[PDB]
Amino acid sequence: GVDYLADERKKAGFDVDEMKIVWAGSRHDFELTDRISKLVASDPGFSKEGRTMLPRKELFKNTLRKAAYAWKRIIELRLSQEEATMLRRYVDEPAFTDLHWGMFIPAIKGQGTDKQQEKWLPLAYKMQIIGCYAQTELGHGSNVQGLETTATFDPQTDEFVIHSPTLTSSKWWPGGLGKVSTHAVVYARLITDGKDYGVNGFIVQLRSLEDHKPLPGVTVGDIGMKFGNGAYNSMDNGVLSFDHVRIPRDQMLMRVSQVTKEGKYVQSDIPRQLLYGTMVYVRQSIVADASLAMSRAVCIATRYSAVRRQFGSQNGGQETQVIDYKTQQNRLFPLLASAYAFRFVGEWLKWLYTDVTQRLAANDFSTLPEAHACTAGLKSLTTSATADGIEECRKLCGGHGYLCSSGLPELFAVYVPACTYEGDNVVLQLQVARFLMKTISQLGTGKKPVGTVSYMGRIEHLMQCRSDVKQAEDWLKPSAVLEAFEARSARMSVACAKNLSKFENQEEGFAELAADLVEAAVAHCQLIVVSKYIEKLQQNIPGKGVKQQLEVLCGIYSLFILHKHQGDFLGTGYITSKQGSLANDQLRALYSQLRPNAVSLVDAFNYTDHYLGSILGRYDGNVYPKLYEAAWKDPLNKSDIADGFHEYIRPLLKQQ
Amino acid sequence: GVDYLADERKKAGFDVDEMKIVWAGSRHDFELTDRISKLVASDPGFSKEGRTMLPRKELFKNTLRKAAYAWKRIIELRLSQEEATMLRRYVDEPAFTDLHWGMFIPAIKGQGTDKQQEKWLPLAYKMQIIGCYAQTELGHGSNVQGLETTATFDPQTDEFVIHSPTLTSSKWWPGGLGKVSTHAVVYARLITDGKDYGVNGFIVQLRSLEDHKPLPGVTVGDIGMKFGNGAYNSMDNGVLSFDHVRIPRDQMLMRVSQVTKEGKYVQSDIPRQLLYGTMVYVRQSIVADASLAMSRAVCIATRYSAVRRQFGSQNGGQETQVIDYKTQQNRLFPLLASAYAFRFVGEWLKWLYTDVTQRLAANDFSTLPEAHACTAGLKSLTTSATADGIEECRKLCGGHGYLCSSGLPELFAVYVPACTYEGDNVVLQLQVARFLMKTISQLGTGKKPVGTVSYMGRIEHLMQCRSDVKQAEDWLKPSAVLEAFEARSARMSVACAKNLSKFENQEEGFAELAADLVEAAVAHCQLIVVSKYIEKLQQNIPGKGVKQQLEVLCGIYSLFILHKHQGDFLGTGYITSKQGSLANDQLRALYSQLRPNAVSLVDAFNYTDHYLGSILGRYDGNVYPKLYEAAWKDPLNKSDIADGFHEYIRPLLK
Ligand SMILES: Cc1cc2nc3c(=O)[nH]c(=O)nc-3n(C[C@H](O)[C@H](O)[C@H](O)COP(=O)(O)OP(=O)(O)OC[C@H]3O[C@@H](n4cnc5c(N)ncnc54)[C@H](O)[C@@H]3O)c2cc1C
Ligand SMILES: Cc1cc2nc3c(=O)[nH]c(=O)nc-3n(C[C@H](O)[C@H](O)[C@H](O)COP(=O)(O)OP(=O)(O)OC[C@H]3O[C@@H](n4cnc5c(N)ncnc54)[C@H](O)[C@@H]3O)c2cc1C
Numbered sequence A: 001g002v003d004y005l006a007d008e009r010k011k012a013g014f015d016v017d018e019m020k021i022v023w024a025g026s027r028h029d030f031e032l033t034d035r036i037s038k039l040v041a042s043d044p045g046f047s048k049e050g051r052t053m054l055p056r057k058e059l060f061k062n063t064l065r066k067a068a069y070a071w072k073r074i075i076e077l078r079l080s081q082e083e084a085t086m087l088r089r090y091v092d093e094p095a096f097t098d099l100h101w102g103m104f105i106p107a108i109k110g111q112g113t114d115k116q117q118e119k120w121l122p123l124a125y126k127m128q129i130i131g132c133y134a135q136t137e138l139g140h141g142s143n144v145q146g147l148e149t150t151a152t153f154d155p156q157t158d159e160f161v162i163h164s165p166t167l168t169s170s171k172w173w174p175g176g177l178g179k180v181s182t183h184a185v186v187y188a189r190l191i192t193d194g195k196d197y198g199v200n201g202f203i204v205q206l207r208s209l210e211d212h213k214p215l216p217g218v219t220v221g222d223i224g225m226k227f228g229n230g231a232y233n234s235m236d237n238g239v240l241s242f243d244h245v246r247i248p249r250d251q252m253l254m255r256v257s258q259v260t261k262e263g264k265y266v267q268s269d270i271p272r273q274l275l276y277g278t279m280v281y282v283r284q285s286i287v288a289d290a291s292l293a294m295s296r297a298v299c300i301a302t303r304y305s306a307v308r309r310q311f312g313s314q315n316g317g318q319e320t321q322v323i324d325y326k327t328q329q330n331r332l333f334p335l336l337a338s339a340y341a342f343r344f345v346g347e348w349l350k351w352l353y354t355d356v357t358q359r360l361a362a363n364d365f366s367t368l369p370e371a372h373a374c375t376a377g378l379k380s381l382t383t384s385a386t387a388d389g390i391e392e393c394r395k396l397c398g399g400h401g402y403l404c405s406s407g408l409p410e411l412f413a414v415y416v417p418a419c420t421y422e423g424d425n426v427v428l429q430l431q432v433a434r435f436l437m438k439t440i441s442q443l444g445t446g447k448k449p450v451g452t453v454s455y456m457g458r459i460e461h462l463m464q465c466r467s468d469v470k471q472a473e474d475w476l477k478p479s480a481v482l483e484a485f486e487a488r489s490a491r492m493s494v495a496c497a498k499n500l501s502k503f504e505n506q507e508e509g510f511a512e513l514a515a516d517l518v519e520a521a522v523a524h525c526q527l528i529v530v531s532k533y534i535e536k537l538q539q540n541i542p543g544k545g546v547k548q549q550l551e552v553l554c555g556i557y558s559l560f561i562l563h564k565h566q567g568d569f570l571g572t573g574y575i576t577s578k579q580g581s582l583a584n585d586q587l588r589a590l591y592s593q594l595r596p597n598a599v600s601l602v603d604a605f606n607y608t609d610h611y612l613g614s615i616l617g618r619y620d621g622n623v624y625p626k627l628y629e630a631a632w633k634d635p636l637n638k639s640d641i642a643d644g645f646h647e648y649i650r651p652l653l654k655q656q
Numbered sequence B: 001g002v003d004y005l006a007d008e009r010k011k012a013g014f015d016v017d018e019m020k021i022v023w024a025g026s027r028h029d030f031e032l033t034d035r036i037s038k039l040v041a042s043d044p045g046f047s048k049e050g051r052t053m054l055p056r057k058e059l060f061k062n063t064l065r066k067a068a069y070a071w072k073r074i075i076e077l078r079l080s081q082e083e084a085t086m087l088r089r090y091v092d093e094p095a096f097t098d099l100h101w102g103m104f105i106p107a108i109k110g111q112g113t114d115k116q117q118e119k120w121l122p123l124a125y126k127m128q129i130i131g132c133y134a135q136t137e138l139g140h141g142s143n144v145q146g147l148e149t150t151a152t153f154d155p156q157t158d159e160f161v162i163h164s165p166t167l168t169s170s171k172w173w174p175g176g177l178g179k180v181s182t183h184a185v186v187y188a189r190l191i192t193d194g195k196d197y198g199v200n201g202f203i204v205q206l207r208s209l210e211d212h213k214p215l216p217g218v219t220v221g222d223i224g225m226k227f228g229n230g231a232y233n234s235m236d237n238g239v240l241s242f243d244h245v246r247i248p249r250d251q252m253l254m255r256v257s258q259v260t261k262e263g264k265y266v267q268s269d270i271p272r273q274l275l276y277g278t279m280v281y282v283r284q285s286i287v288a289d290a291s292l293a294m295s296r297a298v299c300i301a302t303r304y305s306a307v308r309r310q311f312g313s314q315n316g317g318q319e320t321q322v323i324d325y326k327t328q329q330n331r332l333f334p335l336l337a338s339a340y341a342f343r344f345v346g347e348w349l350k351w352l353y354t355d356v357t358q359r360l361a362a363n364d365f366s367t368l369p370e371a372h373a374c375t376a377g378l379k380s381l382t383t384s385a386t387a388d389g390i391e392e393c394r395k396l397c398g399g400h401g402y403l404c405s406s407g408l409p410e411l412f413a414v415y416v417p418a419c420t421y422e423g424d425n426v427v428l429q430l431q432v433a434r435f436l437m438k439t440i441s442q443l444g445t446g447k448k449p450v451g452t453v454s455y456m457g458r459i460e461h462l463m464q465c466r467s468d469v470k471q472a473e474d475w476l477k478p479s480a481v482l483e484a485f486e487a488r489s490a491r492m493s494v495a496c497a498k499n500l501s502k503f504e505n506q507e508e509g510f511a512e513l514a515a516d517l518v519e520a521a522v523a524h525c526q527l528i529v530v531s532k533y534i535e536k537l538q539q540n541i542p543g544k545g546v547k548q549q550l551e552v553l554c555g556i557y558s559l560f561i562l563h564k565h566q567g568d569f570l571g572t573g574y575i576t577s578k579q580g581s582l583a584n585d586q587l588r589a590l591y592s593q594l595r596p597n598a599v600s601l602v603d604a605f606n607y608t609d610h611y612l613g614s615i616l617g618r619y620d621g622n623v624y625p626k627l628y629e630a631a632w633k634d635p636l637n638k639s640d641i642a643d644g645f646h647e648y649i650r651p652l653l654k
Helices: A006-010 A016-024 A028-041 A056-076 A081-091 A098-110 A114-125 A274-305 A326-362 A368-396 A397-400 A406-418 A424-443 A453-464 A474-476 A478-500 A506-512 A515-538 A547-566 A566-570 A578-602 A623-631 A644-653 B016-024 B025-041 B056-074 B082-093 B095-109 B116-126 B277-307 B325-359 B368-396 B398-402 B408-419 B425-441 B451-456 B459-463 B473-475 B478-500 B506-512 B512-537 B546-564 B566-571 B575-605 B623-631 B645-653
Strands: A131-134 A150-156 A159-163 A169-176 A183-194 A195-205 A220-223 A239-242 A245-248 A257-260 A262-266 B129-135 B152-153 B161-164 B171-175 B183-192 B195-207 B218-222 B237-242 B245-248 B257-259 B266-267
Touching: A006 A578, A006 B183, A016 A028, A016 A547, A016 A578, A056 A081, A056 A098, A056 B645, A081 A098, A098 A114, A098 A131, A098 A169, A098 A183, A098 A195, A098 A274, A131 A169, A131 A239, A159 A183, A159 A195, A159 B116, A159 B183, A183 A239, A183 A257, A183 A262, A274 A326, A274 A368, A274 A397, A274 A406, A274 A578, A326 A368, A326 A515, A326 A547, A326 A578, A326 B245, A326 B425, A326 B512, A368 A397, A368 A406, A368 A424, A368 A453, A368 A515, A368 B451, A368 B506, A397 A406, A397 B408, A406 B398, A424 A453, A424 A506, A424 B325, A453 A478, A474 A478, A474 A547, A474 A578, A478 A506, A478 A515, A478 A547, A478 A566, A506 A515, A515 A547, A515 B095, A547 A566, A547 A578, A547 B218, A566 A578, A566 B566, A578 B566, A644 B056, B016 B025, B016 B056, B016 B478, B016 B546, B016 B575, B025 B082, B056 B082, B056 B095, B082 B095, B095 B129, B095 B171, B095 B183, B095 B195, B095 B277, B129 B171, B129 B237, B161 B195, B171 B183, B183 B237, B183 B257, B195 B245, B237 B512, B257 B478, B277 B325, B277 B368, B277 B408, B277 B575, B325 B368, B325 B512, B325 B546, B325 B575, B368 B398, B368 B408, B368 B425, B368 B451, B368 B512, B398 B408, B398 B478, B425 B451, B425 B478, B425 B512, B459 B478, B473 B478, B473 B575, B478 B512, B478 B546, B478 B566, B506 B512, B546 B566, B546 B575, B566 B575
Parallel strands: A131 A183, A150 A183, B129 B183, B152 B183
Antiparallel strands: A150 A159, A159 A245, A169 A239, A183 A195, A220 A239, A257 A262, B152 B161, B161 B245, B171 B237, B183 B195, B218 B237, B257 B266
């Protein structure tokens, strides 16, 4: 087996082994990714062969099998929980285990009392119970405060009654609930003392532990097929309705709020703000996965673009690899750039998480709004860019990209729910907006802004500066780009606050000015990404030519963005046409330098073929023969005559 | 029997029946769509229940049966060609019949001598053969001049020998090829008399008519599974490979090029320019289909946005329909304006086809390079926007949009190939760019330009003019928007062209400025759309409030694009910030007007629930109970214990 990309690899002008380390985040991280990776990859029992053609029932049985087998490797190899996270990542199949570890345990941890965690967590850690997280209902997803499921305390019996008063209050979506889960944390409105104390979490057992039949009064099942072959279809997303299901009182999560023997709401010390610590963690984790999906898609389109030649024969010559084209470059390299950018904004959130929970331990709350907005904005930004980027990578692969065996169709189907869970992307950006608008109106009060909105403390200036770019290369110097993003955002937010303040009723004004508020929120998020990329570049970072390439990636991301939203900077006045053109010319230059390195830079993600499952992105570039061999395995190819043909088509050929 | 959307219907400020007419295109068009669609929709044999969950063997079987049942009704009802195309559209199921009618017949027709169309077309017209169109190879899609499949004439035997020299010469993608077609038009390099004469089409029998087994030399099958549940997996896209298959001399389509007994090449002396069939008609068709897909998505998402409520309870009241939100509006309404806009260009394209086939049949080839780019650029534009709006429409439906049974996942998976077949979108827009660059660099002559580039007969003016919008409503006036877009296109092209003349060789320069060129191409295309819209509004349009509703959508479309590409209006100097904002304020106002009509505007597409196959988009707005009943039909709900459980999960628990 030759490496048909050995020539593209040679052309690299940096140390891939160190790039690997940068992508991974640390030597520890890389060591762990690499060993768990290859260990998932070279094990018969984790094969994805055939997965896309299974009917839902065998797909699902097959998920269960892999789910069990993986648990068994976690045990037999004494992997830590960190390691087990990795192991499941590389198995690469949505399944209940994702929610049990991913949401059910974190909910108990964050919201159960000391006692509650002692009781429920050992069970969940050994999977003597399997739990999911039931919040969304038919009729409520984003608006959590409006859920209809009720939990009504019963003083006569020391139980809550969980009830679904209506069809639409039915739970709908929660993964692992359809078929697998034995228990759920069920969010419902607490009704006690004939008053509504709002939404809380209840640990409700859904099925008998002996035979897995649903308990009395509980109705549970799966909701239906979702988008794509395989994808989330291996996940049992559930509908769940309750008919006065009775639960003991100490099954309410009582960390923050509790209910006495007699009813009556009570509140502990231990601040409800403690929970904002878990926002940051989850959002971080989701931004991390954005860099993961973007990197997988970019890795396939890139390798495919180096191998795919089309046009540009010159006399008898080989045709031009499509990656040599500047239009292929203009759609592809910003996505590459984005994977490294979102990778780094990912690390910066790791830090932001440590900072917030350092402050949470001093009962320091001055930093929380900013932390919340910063994470909402970043989750939104990165999950759109990524969803849009994977469709773009498919398109960049031309017709072959439409084939399941290319890897991109699944990767898009699986990825896209990111845009709606743990916050609708657009709904999160109106939150970002409100906070910027808030941050602007507190200036009058003399309240000086911090973290990621510390730039808004310098508006007088940002309102009136002009870029001073004289040559394309100046767009390379960080202070030029950073200021350019700061100005844009300040100006856009200012323009919103001015526009907004003409409304007597502020709620009216948020409604009417929503589209622009979002446009402002986007600009701010973009600024966070760029400014963190620049911050990253001031770290050391070993390995020959590594930093240098990462600078190239920086420029591309921020200048791609600058061109896309070019009106934003020309509006306000911050840059002139010539200057916009100079940025355009420098992005063009940057594409030409990235070119030799694209394949090496996606080689840096260190993915196996098993994990990638793309014939178009095979490491060795042996694409076409693989696609040919692959077609000869579709069900239709079992014979030269399709079932149906003699019955329906033959008669008509001859007429009958 | 209750319509949850009546309160929205009653808010209409226009005659829906007459908007229906407009959408369809004429009372004749309308009476025809309406009768054939109810026909399909109300016939159990065209049901789509359960499709999406079928394994592939069974989905294919069921395709073959629908196809045959379709042919049986076309015949029993004495349907014409136009009605038959209609019927096949409302069956809503990609199938071989679509290449046979859509590409095999029109290629013979187009590229064959009269003598040849006389022996083949009757055969294909009664479906006594089943043809597909085999151009694309593993290694060559866009680049038709580099297909590797060869066609060597054997003088010693009066035959061409069609051969697949290499694995990557394998024919790959043609639908109807993989299992059903008995013949193909196979495109191959003509090797004759020792010289290579480029691509040509050859009628080749793929399979024994008596028993359907492949003929000696031929290798065919399906290529595998494609994006999305159902969608195109009901189509057998093929791979076909040849070991020197033999074929009579009269199976080369000998209309434009001929080959004589003794070998050797003669040309008909009948201008290969006649192939507007090959372009304007087909691209016309893809553009029409873009409006068709955009309108389905926008229809599901408008209805769903008027049913779904979330937030906005003030004192324990009802939550706000999401359709009242400015962000929903700004994501949804330009999509709705686009369907109407792309619908109207599509009309204008019929005109162009009739104008071009009048001219071609006559003696005038001059209008032709314009007709070519114009249509290329529109295929590109409308398909890109449509594939985007469909994904955007799914996002508009929130979590519920992720379910197959919202209708949207399929609609996206089956539409999106449009961006790649008959011309890759960016490749197509690189061609508009050449034509524009050509149109400039020719101006210094004398011979002023025409059609969709006559605006470049006035570059001098548009190189210097500047907007005089003094308030928001000014952007309503047709002259301001047109001039806004002509100024924009003219400037971008001039800038590209100026930038390019700086190169020693034009090819290197073209390679290098490619993104700026495409960017300029898209601008030229937006102008076309916008200006055909304006012209549409010069027409008699009957019915109360129809024309105003259309004016509103027209503004929406132009100003949404205006805001999105505001850099291009601002940077060239055309407008000032204030004017820019004024454009943004007017767009708001427009959303607010469109609001009460949004649901009636999509009612005017007149789609049945059967066609639309979306619970979220049900005419009657009864969404949630219907989702809930759908869930129970999934095979996982066939019992309470999943297969898998006791074998794998029970021991893990205990
Ligand atoms: C694959 C998948 C897995 C999931 N798994 C789980 C799970 O395990 N547990 C669980 O509890 N849930 C789960 N969910 C539910 C999910 O977490 C989200 O809560 C759900 O997708 C929220 O979407 P929605 O339908 O309510 O969007 P909506 O909020 O109803 O939004 C609908 C549309 O209206 C717009 N809109 C809504 N509000 C506003 C506003 N105020 N202003 C402007 N526009 C607005 C939105 O932008 C969107 O366009 C899952 C969902 C999916 C898709
Ligand atoms: C569903 C489907 C059905 C099809 N059915 C048929 C059929 O029935 N019959 C048939 O003959 N064919 C068929 N095809 C083939 C199809 O019509 C196209 O011709 C083919 O998909 C063209 O794309 P490609 O794969 O050649 O992309 P390529 O041209 O290889 O492009 C790959 C990438 O390279 C880029 N690129 C290529 N050239 C340039 C350039 N010069 N400048 C800048 N960028 C460039 C493209 O933009 C794209 O990003 C079908 C394809 C699909 C997806």
